[model samples]
Target: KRIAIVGAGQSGLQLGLGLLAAGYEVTMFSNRTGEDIRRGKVMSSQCMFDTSLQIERDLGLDHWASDCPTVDGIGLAVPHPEQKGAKVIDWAARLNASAQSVDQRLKIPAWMDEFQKKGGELVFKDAGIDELEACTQSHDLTLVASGKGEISKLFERDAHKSPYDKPQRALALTYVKGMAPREPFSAVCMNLIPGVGEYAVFPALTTTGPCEIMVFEGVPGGPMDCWADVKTPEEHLARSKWILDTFTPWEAERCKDIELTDDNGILAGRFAPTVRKPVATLPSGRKVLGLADVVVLNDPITGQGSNNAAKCADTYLKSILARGDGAADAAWMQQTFDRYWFGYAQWVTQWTNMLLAPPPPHVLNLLGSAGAVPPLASAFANGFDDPRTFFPWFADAAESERYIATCAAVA
Candidate 1:
């Protein structure tokens, strides 16, 4: 029996390869060749924390592990909006286990090139309703992992799970070289400006080699959402620099000598964070399961896009292998997504939504207090590996107070 996966995106590729290794007949669909994608624009920041990276390791897919630069920690800084060169709060701490980001330009194509060597079939096709129906009829199971693909629209939006109706932040990524590295250690340096938005920069491996990635998350209609006039790469760089120089002077200082990795190393776009029911019913009354982004798209303000995709695919991988020759019926399909959604994805969505809404005083207090407390800072930094650790403390004001009070006691 063959398993068909739609989209050559992260989840589809990873899940396809995993099934191949498990000795299953698998056919993965992609619209374009790897060369086509590698020459395309930089896709995402894609910083995978330690735990999610381990899944790739176990699957023997960490091809770039030794070469990629590591994000050893997370640094938080809040600029003084009224005073240039002044910060409201600043702190940095190391993660217990580090994180890394391999450029989509490099990783995806590399995997595609090796996929055939591993006994799986790769078909080039633009996936849509007709193709999905073809795959569903031919394969024992079909999993659609494309969020942007038209075929994915068959999955109805889950109304209760998806509360937001519009984009939360105007997002942009400028991949550049020559930016001064963060001091004390490498980290995902985050600069937060109240009522404006957030800026994050971290080390990553790109097509041209190692570079720093600058991310801008601007509140809609805010001053930071000023990318409308950037028509060229030079203009894009100028805008990115202007943002740093005007809002976060300390950050601008480090980016003084930066140059774009390539003209294509930049992206500026926005999409609504959404959740779709995982089961898609085809016109022929057949069903296919939705995986990863198609079912659980979220704002990447926390840099969880690829990490969640890795996790979701791994969850489906193990669940599929556990079925022991059972049919992947509709009931089994929803259960697989539910296992990952309620157990993990919802926590990520809830935390991200909470942050997009604005931090309560307790969360603000927690971040401010971390600077003075080493253990607290470490706890906060390592929470990126498993967001579930943030728990009630991240949402409940009383729980935050209690957790902060107990931080020293635990150590």
Candidate 2:
């Protein structure tokens, strides 16, 4: 069978490679070539926890594992909003297995070479409706994994599932070198500064060698959200440091002499968290299955975007293999996506969306309690790996009450 994929992102590339390995003819579309992606701007701060990394491992796509730094754990710091320069909550916990962040500029280019080397047809062109119509005509299965492209609108938004119609946070990223590292264990460290929003820093492999990624999520119209005036890369770097100095001075302590990894290493933008119908019908009436972010896009508050994409690739790969000679019809496509969505993505969306809102009293208690309770902190920290572990307690007030009480009792 032939498979056609639009987009050369984590989801599309990984899924196409898996299909190619299974002896299916595969063609994938990308707007950029390996060199183009390598020379372009930084895309995301993807810290893939162990499970997600394992998906890449199984597919032989983790080319940088030996050289890329491991995110040993997840750490949190809540700067006292009112008490200047004070941190009310500070804690870090080790993951059962480590995570790793590789810049997409570095990763996508490498994977493109591998995909082409393995006999998969790699087309360098942006795709739209005409592309979809053509793919469905020749391919047994046509999949769209391009979430941010205009072509993705072929999938209708799931209104109830996607609660927010507008951006929740003003987001930015700065990749740099010469920053001090996290101790106790290297981590995907986060500073949650109440209404001002969040700052996260983690070590990752970028276009240069190993570098640190500083990410900012500012509440709309807040002080940290003010990045419209940063015209140059140096200005972006200055604003990033100023955000640390003003809101969370403790984090700023590490950046005394940090320098940008590249002129293209800084990024700033905003996007809404959205969920769309998994199956999109082209005007040709041939249904195309949407994978990963194309159907379910979440804010980076939980760092689940790339992880979700990895899981989608693995899930869809297995689903496609199990079909065993049957044509992947429209009903079959929906069933494949539903297995991934209902079974996994739902919980990730809930926990990520919940974090975007102001912290509830119970969640506040949970956060505060994690400082005094080691196991509780560990559990909460590891929830970033797979957010399903966060429910019952993390979502509900009463459940959190009982859950916290149990942790307290044991303590």
Give a tens-digit lDDT track for model 1, residues 8-78.
88888889889998899988889889998998888899999999899999999999999899999999999
* Winning candidate number (lDDT): 2
Candidate 2 per-residue C-alpha lDDT over 1-411 given as tens digits, one digit per residue, 9 for 90 to 100: 899999999899899888888999999999877897898899899989999999999988888999999899888899775787899999988899989999999888888788898899988788888898999999999999886777888899999999899999999999999999888689888888887899999999987899999999999999989799999999999999999899888888899999999999999999999999988887878889999999999999889999999999999999999998898998999999899889999999988998999998989889988988888888887888888989889989999988888877876
- TM-score attained by model 1: 0.98
User: How far does residue 242 in candidate 2 sit from its true spot (Å)?
Assistant: 0.4
* RMSD after CA superposition, every candidate: 1.1, 1.0
TM-score for each candidate, following the candidate numbering: 0.98, 0.98
CA deviation > 4 Å runs, candidate 1: 81-83
Question: How many clashes would you count in candidate 1?
Answer: 0
Q: What C-alpha lDDT, on a 0 to 100 scale, does residue 46 get in candidate 1?
A: 93
